[PDB]
Design a binder for this molecule. Structure first.
Ligand SMILES: *[C@@H]1O[C@H](CO)[C@@H](O[C@@H]2O[C@H](CO)[C@@H](O[C@@H]3O[C@H](CO)[C@@H](O)[C@H](O[C@H]4O[C@H](CO)[C@@H](O)[C@H](O)[C@@H]4O)[C@@H]3O)[C@H](O)[C@H]2NC(C)=O)[C@H](O)[C@H]1NC(C)=O
Lengths: 234, 213, 216
């Protein structure tokens, strides 16, 4: 019976493991019986997330309902070469691992432009391929970073709201970002941050591709969840 | 803010001796400390980073160790080219801070200074001032007393000194003394003497000139 | 990998100055960069640090509110705009490369500095610039040049137009009673090569256009 998604992931909540927080990546064994011990799943660190802007808190309990869950070995896309000029993989001092005081979630890649910033972009489309094993469900984790007006213009060539949509399995999501006047930081790494991230997931059923349409600040998916089977959650 | 307390402030050891430099952080910086070597007249160079990692190309006689608040930099067998001031630096937290530095010098064998004298040049005498130069060259130890004798009279307050940093090949110093006074006085006298006191001089050596020969 | 600082000179207090650091030989926009200064005779003192993009800045308290770090990643130049200059800003200013190509710009974009420039010297003073007189030090064989009454330091002294480096001793300048500097440069050559060898010392004091080559 599983309680935590990743045993041997100490100091990690189920939502930390679901997002691939640094120090929170490890074996997630199979289980036919599971207890749902968190009604409102919570993170214990990283860059601060505006969790309730999306359904992201259900992700551990969705994984909980599968018999087998595992984090993919390869990146679902090449984030640095994704559309929108060349990107640098952003890291934050809020997300350390054993060999770096900076880092970021292993499920996502912070696409930071490289003096192609100045160009604010019209909406860009990337296709998210199915990479799991033949009969498995793929859960794709993505999101977007936003910041205050001055930092949005510094990181990106735009201080205006960016808009993000996702599509898979006939299910569409849509978002517009927020500049400044953010909620207080909660469930994060504990360092002050002028911006936040919004994190979402989309399910890709066996053999089904995904689509993300984005602008500046996108968090492109890297490591996806490959899940199969069915587990009795209690 | 994190002070880096570095000790000793200066040391001098023989070639082949062991040199031990410690750096103390007022607070825990964990792993994030580095050691820089600044040779005289040059810019700093990374020797050690992350408290123990030996940077590309630097010899095995250099080694670092420590974590938390205490760090040790060691030259296992001191070499003449290791003449430098060494600095520890923490990069765990802002503001970035350095240690006060540690001057390393060679204690070498007694070398005698070959003494030289220079009268004021033709060009300079035009300009109504006379600078008389005495060169103390390639000696050890650094302690050296030079007295200026104008017509055999001890001058006090009339010259200034300037010593080079220790040489990286023979570990000696070199000194310049410049006796400056008016051309009006430079014509009032004839014999100008530079008297040198040093350990390597069997008898104190003087160098002198007669005015124009 | 090369760093070349420039823009240092004599400024009156309260004025402004900008130093530039021309990076080359490495992917400059992958790395954080650093400014470190050093008062004459004194230790290394950190000034500022900038992330790989322009979005992460850091200043020592001595300069916060007066100095601005910035970079041109296309030009591959690190800048340091210094304003409201104080006499204790007088130092040799070092450009320095971070050893690690950190992508973060919020915290900890600073590690060991593996490449340093040779620095540019900044003197903050209301005193007048004074160029030097270059007198000879006439003659194994010893010879040299006397560089008297200049302000500010530095002067550069070159022997045989840079060829002769063996046995050269250029002494540290001495701040005379007048407030003007004076140094001497000497070199030991064979008396065997005294005849049929014209000896040249090359004194340049950039704060003036005092570029002199004088025979010994
Ligand atoms: C612990 O955290 C640290 C800090 O985040 C982390 O170190 C970083 O790892 C990333 C890998 O994501 C490094 O970036 C790579 O560097 C290599 C070598 O230069 C490049 O070839 C890589 O480019 C390829 O991979 C990208 C995706 O990773 C592709 O988008 C790209 O097109 C290429 O295929 C990539 O840029 C980064 O250099 C280090 N950090 C530093 C400072 O060097 C470390 O991995 C974390 N450890 C664990 C176990 O998670």
């Amino acid at each position: 019976t599983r309680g935590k998604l990743c045993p041997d992931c100490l100091n990690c909540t189920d939502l930390d493991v679901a997002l691939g927080r640094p120090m929170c990546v490890g074996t997630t064994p199979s289980a036919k019986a599971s207890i749902l011990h968190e009604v409102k799943p919570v993170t214990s660190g990283c860059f601060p997330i505006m969790h309730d802007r999306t359904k992201i808190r259900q992700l551990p309990n969705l994984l909980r309902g599968y018999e087998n869950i595992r984090l993919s070995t390869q990146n679902v896309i090449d984030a640095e070469k994704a559309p929108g000029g060349p990107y640098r993989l952003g890291t934050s001092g809020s997300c350390p691992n054993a060999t770096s005081k900076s880092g970021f979630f292993a499920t996502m890649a912070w696409a930071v432009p490289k003096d192609n910033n100045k160009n604010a972009t019209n909406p860009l489309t990337v296709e998210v391929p199915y990479i799991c094993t033949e009969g498995e469900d793929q859960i794709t984790v993505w999101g977007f970073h936003s910041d205050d007006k001055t930092q949005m213009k510094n990181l990106y060539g735009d201080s205006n709201p960016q808009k993000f949509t996702s599509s898979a399995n006939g299910v569409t999501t849509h978002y517009v970002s927020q500049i400044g006047s953010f909620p207080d930081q909660t469930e994060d790494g504990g360092l002050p941050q002028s911006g936040r991230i919004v994190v979402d997931y989309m399910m890709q059923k066996p053999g089904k591709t995904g689509t993300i349409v984005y602008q500046r600040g996108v968090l492109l998916p890297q490591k996806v969840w490959c899940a199969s089977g069915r587990s009795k959650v209690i | 803010d994190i002070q880096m307390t570095q000790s000793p402030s200066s040391l001098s050891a023989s070639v082949g001796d062991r040199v031990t430099i410690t750096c103390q952080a007022s607070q825990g910086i964990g792993n994030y400390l580095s050691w820089y070597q600044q040779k005289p007249g040059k810019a700093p160079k990374l020797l050690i980073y992350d408290a123990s990692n030996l940077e590309t190309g630097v010899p095995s006689r250099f080694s670092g160790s420590g974590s938390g608040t205490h760090f040790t930099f060691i030259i296992i067998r001191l070499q003449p080219e290791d003449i430098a001031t060494y600095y520890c630096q923490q990069y765990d937290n802002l503001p970035l801070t350095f240690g006060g530095g540690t001057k390393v010098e060679i204690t070498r064998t007694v070398a005698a200074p070959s003494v030289f004298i220079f009268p004021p040049s033709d060009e300079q005498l035009k300009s109504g001032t006379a600078s008389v130069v005495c060169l103390l060259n390639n000696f050890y130890p650094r302690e050296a007393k030079v007295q200026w004798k104008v017509d055999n009279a001890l001058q006090s307050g009339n010259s200034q000194e300037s010593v080079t940093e220790q040489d990286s090949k023979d570990s000696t110093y070199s000194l310049s003394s410049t006796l400056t006074l008016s051309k009006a006085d430079y014509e009032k006298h004839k014999v100008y003497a530079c008297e040198v006191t040093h350990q390597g001089l069997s008898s104190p050596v003087t160098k002198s000139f007669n005015r124009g020969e | 990998v090369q760093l070349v600082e420039s823009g240092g000179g004599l400024v009156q207090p309260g004025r402004s100055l900008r130093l530039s650091c021309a990076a080359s030989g490495f992917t400059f926009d992958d790395y954080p960069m650093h400014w470190v200064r050093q008062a004459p005779g004194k230790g290394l003192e950190w000034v500022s640090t900038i992330s790989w993009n322009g979005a992460g800045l850091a200043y020592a308290d001595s300069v916060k509110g007066r100095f601005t770090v910035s970079r041109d990643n296309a030009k591959r130049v690190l800048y340091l705009q210094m304003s409201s200059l104080r006499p204790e800003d007088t130092a040799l200013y070092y450009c320095a490369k971070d050893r690690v190509d950190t992508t973060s710009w919020d915290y900890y974009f600073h590690k060991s500095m593996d490449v340093w420039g040779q620095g540019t010297s900044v003197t903050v003073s209301g005193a007048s610039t004074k160029g030097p007189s270059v007198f000879p030090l006439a003659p194994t064989a010893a010879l040299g040049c006397l560089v008297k009454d200049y302000f500010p330091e530095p002067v550069t002294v070159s022997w045989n137009s840079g060829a002769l480096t063996s046995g050269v001793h250029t002494f540290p300048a001495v701040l005379q009673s007048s407030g003007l500097y004076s140094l001497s440069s000497v070199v030991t050559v064979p008396s065997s090569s005294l005849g049929t060898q014209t000896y040249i010392c090359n004194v340049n004091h950039k704060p003036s256009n005092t570029k002199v080559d004088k025979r010994v």
